[PDB]
Amino acid sequence: PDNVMMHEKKDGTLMNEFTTPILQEVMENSKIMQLGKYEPMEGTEKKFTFWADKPGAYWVGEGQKIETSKATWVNATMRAFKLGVILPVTKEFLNYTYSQFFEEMKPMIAEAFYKKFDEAGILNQGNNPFGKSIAQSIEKTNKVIKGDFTQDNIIDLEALLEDDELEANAFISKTQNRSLLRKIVDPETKERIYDRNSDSLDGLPVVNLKSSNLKRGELITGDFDKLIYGIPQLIEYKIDETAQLSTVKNEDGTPVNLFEQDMVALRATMHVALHIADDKAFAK
Amino acid sequence: PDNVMMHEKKDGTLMNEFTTPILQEVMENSKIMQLGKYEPMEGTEKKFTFWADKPGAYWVGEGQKIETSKATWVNATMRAFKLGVILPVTKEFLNYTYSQFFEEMKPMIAEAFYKKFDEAGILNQGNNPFGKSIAQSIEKTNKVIKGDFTQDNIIDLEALLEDDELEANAFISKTQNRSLLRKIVDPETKERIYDRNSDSLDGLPVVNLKSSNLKRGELITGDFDKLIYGIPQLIEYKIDETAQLSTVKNEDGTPVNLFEQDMVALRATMHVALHIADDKAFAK
Amino acid sequence: PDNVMMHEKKDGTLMNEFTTPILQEVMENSKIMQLGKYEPMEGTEKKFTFWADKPGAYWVGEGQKIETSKATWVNATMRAFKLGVILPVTKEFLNYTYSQFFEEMKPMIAEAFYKKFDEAGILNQGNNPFGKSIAQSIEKTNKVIKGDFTQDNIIDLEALLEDDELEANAFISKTQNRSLLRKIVDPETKERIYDRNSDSLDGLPVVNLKSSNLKRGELITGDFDKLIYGIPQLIEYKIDETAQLSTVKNEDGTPVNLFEQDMVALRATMHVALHIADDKAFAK
Amino acid sequence: NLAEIARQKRIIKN
Amino acid sequence: PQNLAEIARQKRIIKN
Amino acid sequence: PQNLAEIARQKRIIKN
Structure with a gap:
């Protein structure tokens, strides 16, 4: 229903028309995003790993091996703020309408997401953890190099x-x-x-x-x-x-x-599928 | 109302048809629009900056960051003698009208304006700067190299x-x-x-x-x-x-x-963002 | 659009009929008003200063006339609290209308703005300073009698x-x-x-x-x-x-x-015209 | 308006 | 969701 | 103003 027209909507879900632009800017700015491959999910997803030893109508007792299961969840929220403090009150945005606000907000919100995401996602420091991470996987398997x-x-x-x-x-x-x-x-x-x-x-x-x-x-x-x-x-x-x-x-x-x-x-x-390396300074 | 026809209206304000061409000459000539950025403003705009924290509904976090508020102002003038050179009001100005006027001093007036912007922008030797400048940012944040x-x-x-x-x-x-x-x-x-x-x-x-x-x-x-x-x-x-x-x-x-x-x-x-570098010779 | 009738309007500017009586009381209650001189403006304004001399005569000498331009900035604020709570908004405001609300309010908000104008006017102890004050003028041009x-x-x-x-x-x-x-x-x-x-x-x-x-x-x-x-x-x-x-x-x-x-x-x-006297004791 | 009202109810002069 | 994954492969650092 | 913005982005040494 809504497109250009006006802007007096306090609460609201963004349309997929505007969801792809904001995420497009997030893709380039975020470092982990650029490297990764994004398969689609809903609230959760169950993924299994490994292969198996398979003969054709003979079979000797060997190569039974392990199979591993895994599921994923937890979110990554971030605030806009910048636009809001620059451009005050709704009547001022009534002239801008729905289409104008998102394009003007585009770089501020997209810049915000990746900063928080990478600060907790790669290095496990920022207060929004979820177990699976780059720095955390290196604690399991030591891939350390000197400075x-x-x-x-x-x-x-x-x-x-x-x-x-x-x-x-x-x-x-x-x-x-x-x-x-x-x-x-x-x-x-x-x-x-x-x-x-x-x-x-x-x-x-x-x-x-x-x-x-x-x-x-x-x-x-x-x-x-x-x-x-x-x-x-x-x-x-x-x-x-x-x-x-x-x-x-x-x-x-x-x-x-x-x-x-x-x-x-x-x-x-x-x-994370695990086995990722890291060099760090030793000095003394 | 004005276009070609005649010239007589002494005072006034330029049409957008004859503003963009004269201003284009300033932009291309100057060493600032070539190497810089742009946004529109209305009299004296105000800018807000810096990224907020925001948790993902789990824990508020112990980072705690700040918000910075800023602004811009001040304008420049130029009184050229180039119209005294092309004076003949009886014959020429009637033939030249409101179109050929600006074409004759399209390089000039724009020329004087573009030079002074960089004079009090990149360096701060001029007498119409408004605080923010590259030379002043180097004096604030020492990035000077000698070699x-x-x-x-x-x-x-x-x-x-x-x-x-x-x-x-x-x-x-x-x-x-x-x-x-x-x-x-x-x-x-x-x-x-x-x-x-x-x-x-x-x-x-x-x-x-x-x-x-x-x-x-x-x-x-x-x-x-x-x-x-x-x-x-x-x-x-x-x-x-x-x-x-x-x-x-x-x-x-x-x-x-x-x-x-x-x-x-x-x-x-x-x-300016207040982080720009400079190099000079070693005094010996 | 609105006159009297009702009150289901939380946001927006006041009608100038109900605004101007409050400013009357702000002026009456304030001591800085009684000391100073008013003038009209819109948001931010430039104005000129000092007296002028009479020409028209044959001229012999006289002193020159000093002129200078001044700009004005900064905005005031007030969370009222006490009256809104006491007359539970909306439905009680419906009986009190748009008119009788601000008539009852007028007294205390005017005194409140007065208190802050004087507190951040004569001296720095007030919460909202704007640039120049009487205390600051004394610090620059030092003239003190002691005890x-x-x-x-x-x-x-x-x-x-x-x-x-x-x-x-x-x-x-x-x-x-x-x-x-x-x-x-x-x-x-x-x-x-x-x-x-x-x-x-x-x-x-x-x-x-x-x-x-x-x-x-x-x-x-x-x-x-x-x-x-x-x-x-x-x-x-x-x-x-x-x-x-x-x-x-x-x-x-x-x-x-x-x-x-x-x-x-x-x-x-x-x-401030920067030349003001001062007195304060010391003893020990 | 404000300047005239001020001058009408100012202590100085008048 | 599916369009985002299509855009991702186009806007990746290493297209594969 | 609006036309200026388009020209400023277009007529620039870095990224066009």
Whole structure:
């Protein structure tokens, strides 16, 4: 029913017309997203792993093996805020209408989602955990490398993935770490490893994590399943906040300090097949 | 109402048909729209920034981040003598009308305006700046490097932005510096860096600002917000000005010598993220 | 559209019929009004300053006329609370209509805005400062008399500003600092400086500031601008407050404790001609 | 309006 | 949901 | 203003 026309809708589910644009901007900005492969689900999904030994009308008693089951859930919510405080009251958005608001909000909400998602999803730090994660899988299987940036260490890092019959695909290095990567050249084969123009380390694309949970680190991915469900779903807000902070020390009292916020609850799920490597600085 | 036909209306405000062409010349000529960004504004807009926390209905979190509120203001003027050059009001202005007028001083008036914007924008030597500028941001946040044009020093320069989780985009450097950019021969790999044909340092486009205030150094830019607004004003009066010179010794009075003046005041504002780098020589 | 009849309208601007009586009482209750000079405006305005001289004669010399431009900013605010709760909104407001509501309100909101105008006007102890104040002017242009209630010192405060700048005018003094002024006497002639009936030290009118801040304090101001626009948009919401405090030492919970509240927002602004006297004791 | 009302009920002058 | 997965493969870093 | 925005995005050295 609604399209352009007006904008006086406080509560409301976003239409799939607008859900694909907002998620399109989230896809490029998020680092884990770019690397992963997203199969569709609802509230939950049950996935099974492994193969089996199978002969043709003979069979000797060997190769029984293990089969593993797994299910996934838990959400990833984030706030818009920015648009709301810049553009106040509904009558002001009545001129903008439904179509105008989403396009103008597009980069702010999309920037928000990935920052929180990666801060808890890759490094297990941000307060929205769900067990399955990159940093958590490394605690199970030790793939640790010492703090030196030479070709042989990156070869040894990839070799640790090869030990458990697995191929390297992509890389994750911090923006600050980009300086040290470029100044690594072998004496015999005089060629630069990390190419500046085509962002890749060993002919494999590096993706720059903007989160401040790294220093001199490299993460590696390949077979990885992120999932998404439903809608972003918006609610207009003229009420008190606990989560946010108003500059000095007091909170975001929306009707106290005359603002007009927005709430956007997106539903995103994660699954990990395990065996992922990581280099970290040792120093002393 | 106005188009071709005639010229007579002394005061007024420009049509959008003749605003965009004269303003286009400012944008292409200036070293700021070429290397920057844009949004619309209405008089003096206000900007809000920074990302909120938001939990996923599990736990509020112990991060706690803040919100920042900002704004922009102040406009520029220009009174050129170019209409005194093309004076003949009886014959020419009747033939030229409201169309050919602006075409004759399409390069000029726009010329003077574009130069001064960069003069009090990239550097802060001018006397109409409004706080936010690249030179002032460097004085606030020390990113100054002292050394010659070596490969490692160019990488170091760029790495300052990377150190605070920000990506480099393009370069600002004058044509006199181009000679010293040629000699960047690396000890390893491609032995070049700077492309001779296409003016680019590290695959990032170098913009040639031809100011008198740049000796031998490089500035990086890629996070501006330039804000033009309002159709420009035009006035036609033959009068005495307080400042300015008539010929050589004495003040410019109209009754003494019959000139004619043309004013164009375009309102324009800037903003910066306060993280921009600079390189200079070592004082010895 | 709305006149009297009903009240089922939480948001929106007031009708100017019911606005202008409140501003009357704001002016009456305020001491800064009685000290300052009003002028009309809309949101933000530029205005000019100082006197001018008469031309038309043959001219011999005279002094030049000083001119200067001033801008005005910053907005006021007020969570009313006490009356909204006492007359449970909507259905009780239906009996009270749109008209009789604001007629009953008028008294206390005017006094409330007064209190804040003076508290953040003469001194910095008020919550909302805008740029310049009387206390801040004293810090820049330092002129202080320390711990004196004799006859001579009274003239010194006037003489300080009757030397740099011209003409002294009104005084200010709190109720506690009142009896001491009455107790003073001239040795030559039997007569009091401060008169009990008519509040005037040197025959210029004095007003009584109720704010409990000063102990021994007197200051002089003549030319001073007080500024109001007169849009008091009312917005009604029933959620947890920051400023409002309930009964003892508990956060005000409008949902828990079934109350209701209204918020009003004025447009307070000043500007200072920076030359004002001061008096304050030291002892030890 | 406001300036005239102020001047009508100001203590200074009048 | 299915359109999002189609867009993902197109807008991936490594198309496969 | 609106036409300006389109020209500003189009007529630029970096990304068109």
